[PDB]
Amino acid sequence: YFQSNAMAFNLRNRNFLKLLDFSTKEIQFLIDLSADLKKAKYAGTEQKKLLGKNIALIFEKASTRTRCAFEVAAFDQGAQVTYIGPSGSQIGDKESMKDTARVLGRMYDGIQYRGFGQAIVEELGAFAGVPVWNGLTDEFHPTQILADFLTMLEHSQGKALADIQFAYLGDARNNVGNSLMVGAAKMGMDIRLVGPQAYWPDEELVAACQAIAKQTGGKITLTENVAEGVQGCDFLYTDVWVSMGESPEAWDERVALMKPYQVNMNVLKQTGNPNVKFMHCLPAFHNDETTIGKQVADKFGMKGLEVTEEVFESEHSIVFDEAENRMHTIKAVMVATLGS
Amino acid sequence: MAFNLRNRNFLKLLDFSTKEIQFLIDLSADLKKAKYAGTEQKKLLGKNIALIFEKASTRTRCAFEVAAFDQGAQVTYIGPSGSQIGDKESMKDTARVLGRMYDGIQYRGFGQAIVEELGAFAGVPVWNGLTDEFHPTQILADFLTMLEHSQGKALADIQFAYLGDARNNVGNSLMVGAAKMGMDIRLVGPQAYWPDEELVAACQAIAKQTGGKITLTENVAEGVQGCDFLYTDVWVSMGESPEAWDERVALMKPYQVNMNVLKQTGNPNVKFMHCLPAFHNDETTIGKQVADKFGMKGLEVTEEVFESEHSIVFDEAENRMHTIKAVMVATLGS
Amino acid sequence: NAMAFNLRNRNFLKLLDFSTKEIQFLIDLSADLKKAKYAGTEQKKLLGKNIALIFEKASTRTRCAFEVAAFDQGAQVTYIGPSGSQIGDKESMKDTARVLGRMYDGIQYRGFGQAIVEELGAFAGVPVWNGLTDEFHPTQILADFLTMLEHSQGKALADIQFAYLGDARNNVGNSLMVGAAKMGMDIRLVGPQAYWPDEELVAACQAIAKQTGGKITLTENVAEGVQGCDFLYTDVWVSMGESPEAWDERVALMKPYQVNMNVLKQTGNPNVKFMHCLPAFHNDETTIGKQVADKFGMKGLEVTEEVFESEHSIVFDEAENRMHTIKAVMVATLGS
Ligand SMILES: [Cl-]
Ligand SMILES: [Cl-]
Ligand SMILES: [Cl-]
Ligand SMILES: [Mg+2]
């Protein structure tokens, strides 16, 4: 080790609310720590850093991966958890977030929140007096992108993040697209957002990310042209075209518009890269074995929406590794911020 | 045997041999005794388990949770809402995600095919806490209960009758179970509600190799004669209102378990069993409605039978936990 | 000493089931567990115990308090939350209790009528703890009493005076009155007469108070009710499971019993502290509190933002104390 201890010190007791709050080196540290926790777990060697800690998991919206990842990470690390689901949160109905935060802060050692506006999780993080972690808001999904970056490194045969190029296809203005962009800029990556112009991320956020990328040697491109957007890419990433809490009416105008950005074998071919890999944050509509995906695909005469079955189940697909990595990276966040 | 059960799924009794099942029951008895003596050894220490419930059932859920906790495991309960399951995400995808994070997975839900797909794709042991077709954990508990209440008689020596609607998961599983263990079972109920004929035939073939016996009849007196245990279950549909129940009630009524039926066994030591919940009085809102509408205090069983010295329903309910514990310990335990 | 032995395996269903000294022992035990936790010295008395948490109505504080208390003490919990079926719809409480009692070492219940939790307590065969019913909320009042002692500079409970404002016939009002009487306190219930506690309960509390040197007063008069008080307490004017229509004819009636700075002033006590069981409607940062206040042109309902956020307010200490006191209950009744 000639490895700087600065980042571990600086992460203690921090919140984890969005990637904008962290430096390039803090993010890289979290990723490295994830890889170490993953290896220790696989070897049966894990040391518990959250022993006797109690954590509250507030979910104002649904979750499989994120909830499970927080629970399993906590359990592995010796913590106990209270899961408060959508019909359990009183928040903003009967009790303010300020009040809730102060009450939970007195009983728990750490708090996860998944919900609506970034402003809510920021208020929670300002008032709880303990580390608060964002498990998804309307604007950002930071833990997902940690997982994505660990996954890219593992699947890149020695290449660093600064050296990787990737394209995100579809609706770029969603939490995942925003976080991928902030992330790419911070780590010095080359990201292409490839989708209809009306769904590019907020201009203000793009400009802040362009400024970050200039200092890190990263690169950000927005385009409607699939062939140009995906050329040379190591990874292709997509997500369901409609977000959590949006009405079924959102699918009316979006499909014909989003259709040309579907990830299919042809798109993988246009990368020119036989080693291209496919990523997706999940859940995905890639066949008819989903009630919603079946009806929508049928309604518009399709077989799979944002990605096809052939791509999803091909050897190019690394979605299940990526999913597993949610737990390891969330573990790193809790260990760095709350671990002793 | 112990070696052979490691990492198996527990999806239905048809997947196991007579001796495997007996091993599970024996292991249950041992774990029960160890718990009672304060002597229990934890075999699931460091294990994390996901409990998927697509339809709620607080009894099966509680048995999994208590069994896991006693054995040093931690659990994540995923109930009918708050998940992404059946609707936003396929079972194949869910299975592969959960399998990466958890060491074992319980599922309670709809078709056997779903729990089979989960079991084929998760990469870890998957346990069936109830599907439309089978309810294997309930029958383990039932068999342990019978052995405990039979003064040293083995299962092969026991005779029992199940009354009512035999065409569902508990009836199916009792029949598969009886056949495997060489028992003498009578299914006593209207012919239209006997189990699937294909399943009966497969059970008849099993019963031949084990010296078991299977009888289906509409005759109560003949069905219950000589029985050590009488078993029943709710026979109206829970998805339906008490207003829809007229036909089914009149049809099932003569198979009610009441004191007379116990008498017709000719066995003063006969015991009464029920998987629960049970409609045995007018204390509930649904019991009040039924009492008003059909002039009946209790449906499949009467209050007098349910609360009598013959009833072992609460021992049977406690045994859900000890048996579920054995399943997890045998398949995942270190 | 005697009290510890006498509490083992008891239910905790209402304060009317305990003696003065048992309550004081619970409070003392709470303070000891609080200190042990803060010092990293806590001994786990509930190791290997499994506890069922039945919630038929919503909770933040009470659920969390039970979970954290159980975890700190080495227990594990199963949370069974509100659904479309209540116990008694399709399975009796008598059946449920006997099944849970075979699997769990202790059971919490929050729900509707006190008769339900009494039935659970009669049939479970293990200690059963009332986390709130229509009639009573006993764990809340333990927490309140610990909090008052901590904020009273060595004064005992018998020496404290406090007023509860608003709808006095709710679970918290009833339990504060039973509590005051048991511990020899001077309580004033200050609210419209139609919302005073049942006459049968008042009379039982008056008889208790007489032998403890406590005092109970009911009045519609704020000034006279709050004069000389160490603590002022209030709660939301409409209870859980009442219809949203209840607000409409209750706000105007309750409005004069709002806790605002004037009221604090009428105590004549510069050291007066403010308490609330929570949650509270004190500004526009909830959809319900904003809509109801807006309907009558108000800012805050039962308490104002200014009072809620002032140095007089000890509501967050009070909330933290829910956990320490719930822990005492479990440890005394079930703790090996
Ligand atoms: Cl982010
Ligand atoms: Cl089976
Ligand atoms: Cl009380
Ligand atoms: Mg482990």
> For residue C296, how many other CB atoms are within 10 A of its CB?
12
Could you tell me the strand order of the sheet in which B213-217 lies?
Answer: B213-217, B184-188, B159-163, B229-232, B271-274
Total Cβ atoms within 10 A of residue B6: 12
Resolution value in angstroms: 2.2
Does C99 sit within 8 Å of B317, measured CB to CB?
A: yes
Ligand closest to the CA atom of residue A48: 4
Measure the CA–CA gap between B68 and C139, rounded to whole angstroms: 29
Instruction: Tell me how far apart the alpha carbons of residues A212 and B249 are, in angstroms, rounded to a whole number.
Output: 73
Nearest by Cα to A240 from A319, A150, A330: A319
Tell me which DSSP letter residue C286 carries: S
Q: Say yes or no: B297 and B157 in one domain.
A: yes
Same domain, C229 and C328: no
Residue C57 in tokens:
């109505």
Give the residue carrying structure tokens 């029943």. B232
- CA dist A224 to A259, A271, A280, B22, C306, Å? 12, 15, 20, 65, 54
CA A305 vs. chain centroid, Å, equals 20
B79 touches A87 (CB < 8 A): no
Q: Is B52 on the interface with A (CB under 8 A)?
A: no
Residue type for A213, please?
Answer: A
Assess contact for A115 and A140: CB atoms under 8 A: no
| Domain identity same for C40 and C99 | yes
Which residues make Cβ contacts (< 8 Å) with residue B293, sequence separation at least 6? B242, B243, B245
Nearest to C279 among A54, A85, A99 (CB): A99
**Which residue is it, tokens 């009155």?**
C177
CB C105 within 8 A of CB C49: yes
Same domain, C71 and C205: no
| Residue type (1 letter), A279 | M
Sign of CA dihedral B177, B182, B183, B187: positive
CA angle (A24, A25, A29) in 5-degree steps? 125
Pair C286, A93: CB distance under 8 Å: yes
DSSP H or E run through B126: strand B126-130
d(CA B282, CA C94): 13
Ligand 2 centroid–CA B276 distance in Å is: 17
Q: Which residue, C208, C237, C59, C61, is CA-closest to C142?
A: C61
How crowded is residue C53: how many other Cβ atoms within 10 Å of its Cβ?
Answer: 23
Subunits that touch chain A (at least 3 Cβ pairs < 8 angstroms)? B, C
What does the block give as tokens for B282? 């007018």
To the query of whether residue C188 is one of the catalytic residues in this protein, the response is no
Residue C235 annotated in active site: yes
Strands C161-165 and C186-190: parallel
Classify burial at C295, counting beta carbons within 10 Å of its beta carbon; exposed 0-12, middle 13-18, buried 19 or more: exposed
Same domain, A169 and A304: yes
Sheet containing C215-219: which strands, arranged edge to edge?
Answer: C215-219, C186-190, C161-165, C231-234, C273-276
| CA end-to-end span of chain C | 15
Which amino acid is it at B140?
L
* Of A321, A134, A326, residue with least CA distance to A235: A321
Same domain, C80 and C201: no
Strand partners, A57: A83, A112
Q: Enumerate the residues of chain C whose CB falls inside 8 A of the CB of residue A87.
A: 81-82
Is C313 in the same domain as C327?
no
Say if residues B81 and B137 touch (Cβ distance below 8 Å): no
Q: Say how far apart CA A31 and CA B87 lie, in whole Å.
A: 32
The DSSP-derived string for C105-153 is SEEEEE-S-HHHHHHHHHHSSS-EEEEE-SS--HHHHHHHHHHHHHTTT
Q: Which helix (H) or strand (E) holds A59?
A: strand A54-59
Give the nearest partner residue to C286 out of A54, A80, A96, using CB atoms: A96
Is C327 found in the same domain as C187?
A: no
Which three-class secondary structure string do you get for C56-83? Answer: CCCCCHHHHHHHHHHHHCCCEEEEECCC
DSSP A4-53: -THHHHHHTT--B--GGGS-HHHHHHHHHHHHHHHHHHHHT----S-TT-
Positive or negative: CA dihedral C133, C138, C141, C143: negative
Kindly state whether residues A216 and A277 are assigned to the same domain: yes
The DSSP symbol for B45 reads: T
Nearest partner of A100 among A127, A82, A136, judged by Cα: A127
What does the DSSP 8-state code read for residue B90?
A: -
CB atoms within 10 A of CB B179: 26
What's chain C's length in residues? 336
Residue pair C89/C115 in contact by the 8 Å Cβ criterion: no
Check residue C15 and report its DSSP letter: G
- Do A276 and A287 fall within a single domain? yes
CA quadruple B254, B260, B263, B268: dihedral, nearest 10 = 120
A118 and A169 part of one domain: no
The minimal CB distance from B87 to the residues A86, A292, A323 is found for: A292
Helices A142-154, A319-338: crossing angle, 10 deg rounding: 120
Looking at the complex, report in whole angstroms how far the Cα of residue B208 sits from the nearest Cα belonging to chain C. Answer: 37
Catalytic residue flag (residue C186): no
Strand partners, A191: A166, A220
d(CA B169, CA A32): 50
* Beta-carbon count within 10 A of B264 CB: 17
Contact B213, B200 (CB under 8 A): no
CATH at residue B101:
3.40.50.1370
Residues within 5 Å of ion ligand 3, judged at the Cβ atom = C 14-15, 136, 138, 175, 178
Q: How does DSSP classify residue C182?
A: H
Q: Residue A165 corresponds to which amino acid?
A: Q
| Distance from the Cα of residue A196 to its chain's centroid | 21
Strands of the C76-80 sheet, one edge to the other: C76-80, C50-55, C106-110, C128-132
Burial of C241 (0-12, 13-18, 19+ CB in 10 A): exposed
- Structure tokens, B130: 């109830």
Peptide bond into C279 cis (omega under 30): yes
Number of H helices, E strands in chain A: 14, 9
With CA atoms as reference, report the closest residue to C162 among C222, C233, C212, C217: C233
Other CB atoms within 10 A of residue A299 CB: 11
With contact defined as beta carbons under 8 Å apart, do A96 and C285 qualify? yes
In sequence order, the β-bridge partners of residue B85 are B89
Give the separation between CA A103 and CA A116, rounded to whole angstroms. 20
What are C158's two structure tokens? 């018998």
Find the Cα–Cα–Cα–Cα dihedral C195, C197, C200, C202, rounded to 10°.
-130
Determination technique for this entry: X-ray
Mapping DSSP to helix (H, G, I), strand (E, B) and coil, where does residue B14 land?
helix
Residue C309 DSSP code: T
Sole residue written with tokens 């209050």: B303
| φ, ψ at A67 (rounded to 5°) | -65, -50
Q: Give the C-alpha separation, C267 to C282, whole Å.
A: 21
Tokens describing residue A226? 């699939």
Locate tokens 């000493």: which residue? C1
β-strand partners of B78: B52
The total number of structural domains in chain C stands at 2
Q: CA-to-CA distance for B54 and B247, rounded, in angstroms?
A: 29
H/E stretch holding B324? helix B313-332
Quote the tokens at residue A138. Answer: 């309307």
Tokens for A118?
């970034």
For residue A318, count other CB atoms closer than 10 A to its CB.
18
Give residue C152's identity as a one-letter amino acid code. Answer: S
Q: Is the distance from CB of A263 to CB of A308 less than 8 angstroms?
A: yes
How far apart, in whole angstroms, are the C-alpha atoms of residue B104 and residue B123? 9
Record: contact B276-C95, CB cut-off 8 A: yes
The domain of A121 spans 1-143+326-340
Nearest-angstrom CA–CA distance, C318 and C308: 13
| Tokens read off for A36 | 């170490």
Cβ–Cβ under 8 Å, residues B26 and B78 = no
Same-domain check for residues B148 and B120? no
Measured between alpha carbons, how far is C331 from C26 in angstroms, rounded to an integer? 9
Cβ pair C119, C98 in contact under 8 A: no
Q: Is the peptide bond before B277 cis (omega within 30 degrees of 0)?
A: yes
As a whole number of angstroms, the distance between CA C245 and CA A195 comes to 49
Strand partners, C110: C55, C132
Helices then strands (H, E): number in chain B? 14, 9
A271, A263 contact by CB (below 8 A): no
Q: Is A12 annotated as a binding residue?
A: no
Residue in A214, A207, A237 with CA at minimum distance from that of residue A312:
A237
